[PDB]
Amino acid sequence: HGIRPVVSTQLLLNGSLAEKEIVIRSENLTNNAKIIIVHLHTPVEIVCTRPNNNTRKSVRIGPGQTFYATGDIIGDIKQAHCNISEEKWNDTLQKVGIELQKHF
Amino acid sequence: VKNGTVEEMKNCSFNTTTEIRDKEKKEYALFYKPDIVPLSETNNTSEYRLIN
């Protein structure tokens, strides 16, 4: 099926969804050095944004090859940030906790 | 750009080679702080370098 090559470290974005319930995968639960994967059943909406309005510059670095950088910021300076819903995230964490409690 | 809680950017000017390869001109650009490192261990708050 369609495989999404999304680059992420802590979370999984735009992945597949489980059929019935959250499913926990691990090579061996006894070994703490391994990495434990949790595949969710319901997605969690996440909205990231960069409010800054950057300007694209062009500098002739070498012959016939241009270099692009940030020239100036128009308006005020703000913080780029990501938003998720607290209630849905807490419910998802509780679901993951009850799923983990089977092994513990 | 002035003090604030934002990560902010640094306005750095440097000499770039123009279309003539034996001539230089002055240019400037805004760079992120993680991409900027002090050039040398000596105390100098005006001279910097890329992280590369």
Epitope: N53, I74, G75, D76, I77, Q79 | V1, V6
Partner: antibody, heavy 126, light 110 residues
Framework: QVQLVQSGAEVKKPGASVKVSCKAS????????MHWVRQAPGQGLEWMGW????????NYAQKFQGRVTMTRDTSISTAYMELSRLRSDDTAVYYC????????????????????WGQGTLVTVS | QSALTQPASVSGSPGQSITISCTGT?????????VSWYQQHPGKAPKLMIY???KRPSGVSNRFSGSKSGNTASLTISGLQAEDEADYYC??????????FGGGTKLTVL
């Protein structure tokens, strides 16, 4: 409540510089932007610029960059407007207004929402 | 440099519905929903009447309204009185953190 107070009257010869003080009371000075506009007699409202009290970030409209400057004093909570190179047509009332809310997540500087206005400073170059 | 295009004179009568429309370029009113209407009597400071095209601030009655279509915005006033004879200004956000005001209008009551 929210109160903005400026100078009453101002007389200045052409070619000099003028300082206008906008003192705000009744609310946190660093919570909202501060806008400066100008109104000539007969003519409507001309928008000059805005200033963020927290940082030193200021923005001015066209035909005013370099000619005017905006600063602030947080200890006394007073905005300063320094205008140089006064001409014969600069005889006008300068008004100080309160902009949007500073949130640090979206740009609220450009919203034209001015709840409160000062009495205005009348600069005369007659 | 040109400001927003606004009528210079609007006349009406008491107990009538009158609309004053201000229009601008494709960058000021074409894709931004920040249009405000202020009123100003001579000799005193202005005050807000309508903000965000159709919303109403606290302290203003239900006499005023608003609209937003294409590249123009209209202030509709129903039930005019003799107190409404003053200046009306239509302000908008022109992009790049710039605020632009209208040309100016003077409401007349016959």
């Amino acid at each position: 409540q929210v109160q903005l107070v400026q100078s009453g009257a101002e007389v200045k010869k052409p070619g000099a510089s003028v300082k206008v003080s906008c003192k705000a009371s009744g609310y946190t000075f660093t919570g909202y932007y501060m806008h400066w506009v100008r109104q000539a007699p007969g003519q409507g409202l001309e928008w000059m610029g805005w200033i963020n009290p927290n940082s030193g970030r200021t923005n001015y409209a066209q035909k005013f960059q370099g000619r005017v400057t905006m600063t602030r004093d947080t200890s006394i909570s007073t905005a300063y407007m320094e205008l140089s190179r006064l001409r014969s047509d600069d005889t006008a009332v300068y008004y100080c207004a309160r902009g949007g809310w500073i949130s640090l997540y979206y740009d609220s500087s450009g919203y034209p929402n001015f709840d409160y206005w000062g009495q205005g400073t009348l600069v005369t170059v007659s | 440099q040109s400001a927003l295009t606004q009528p210079a004179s609007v006349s009406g009568s008491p107990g009538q519905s009158i609309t004053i429309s201000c229009t601008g370029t494709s960058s000021d009113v074409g894709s931004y929903n920040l249009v405000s209407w202020y009123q100003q009597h001579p000799g005193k400071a202005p005050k807000l009447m309508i903000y965000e095209v159709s919303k109403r601030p606290s302290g203003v009655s239900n006499r005023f309204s608003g609209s937003k279509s294409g590249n123009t915005a209209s202030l509709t006033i129903s039930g005019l009185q003799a107190e409404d004879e003053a200046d009306y200004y239509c302000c908008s956000y022109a992009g790049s953190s710039t605020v632009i005001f209208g040309g100016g209008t003077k409401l007349t009551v016959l």
